[PDB]
Amino acid sequence: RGSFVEMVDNLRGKSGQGYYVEMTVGSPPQTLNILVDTGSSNFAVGAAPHPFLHRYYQRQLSSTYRDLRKGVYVPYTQGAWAGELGTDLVSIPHGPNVTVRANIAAITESDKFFINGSNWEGILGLAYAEIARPDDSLEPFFDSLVKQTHVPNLFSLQLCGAVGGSMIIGGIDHSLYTGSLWYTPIRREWYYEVIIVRVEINGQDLKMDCKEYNYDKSIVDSGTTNLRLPKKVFEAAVKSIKAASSTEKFPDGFWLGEQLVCWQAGTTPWNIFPVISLYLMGEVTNQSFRITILPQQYLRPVESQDDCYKFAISQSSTGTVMGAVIMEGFYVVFDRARKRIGFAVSACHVHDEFRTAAVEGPFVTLDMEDCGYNI
């Protein structure tokens, strides 16, 4: 097909448990399944037995492993891991045709990091050095890839929900999207930080100050499932989504993600839930565009003749997180070279006969520079 055809369909995963790519480390080769995470910046792999790991990195068997003689610890809200730094040869067999020497954290102990049944054994942090542990001197994988090889400073992700998808490294594959790509600036190179300028539920403006949408940052994060929204925005969004779906009644805990609702197999009334639109800052002054997702993105199937769903928009205290709920509607281009993120309708996104995810523009939005949080 296209020149990047061998990278198509190189991602796998279980719904809600993350998308992973095969990476081959060391010499002789040790291939592991690695979570693709645009929300972090460390390359780390399980390196000792764990109940949830089918396999792990064995440094003593790798002739090319070099010990950096330094520990590393990486905390999150929901888990953490500890390990040991070194470097080794790394290739991605269904990625670019190169081999690089990369930093690698060998995970030796962990708490609620690995996921039983997820089939991944490590994490590939694709964001920038600023948020690497132990500090920004530990060069992230993609930075090593670009520094050591000819591979262009860009990658793109098509996450196909219920899983699989494509990580195209060094370019764009045009079979993965329809319509046009629309770009938003990367505000600052740490997370993949962006600026949300307007939010609509079924076309109805939430009417909050755009500063609220980005308090205290908005990021694109493939390593987390939900669309996470700052508290005030979450509360307003839930009120609006409830209003739009009021022909049906759901318990309060459903909107909190604490209760599931199930339908008999194949009867989910998708039409009664609204679409959700985020407007993003464009590349020209006073110009924006909007991305729109369906309930097929934000209502997640969990684990018979009953189809149970979890509401996957949740409250955040660390800003807006555009997780898989957002990314599964779109082909997302991380154009690091031009400091921008592109969105187009995904050729694989889950939809129905009546509605589709959308990327539309341009719109006119004034004073967008004020939406961003400072310090």
Ligand SMILES: CC(=O)Nc1c(Cl)cc(CNC(=N)NC(=O)Cn2ccc3ccccc32)cc1Cl
């Ligand atoms: C079991 C589990 O969640 N493992 C895990 C995975 Cl799969 C990825 C990561 C890396 N994290 C991200 N890429 N993004 C976030 O953690 C986004 N985030 C930021 C705050 C927060 C709170 C609850 C859930 C997610 C939250 C951390 C962990 Cl501990």
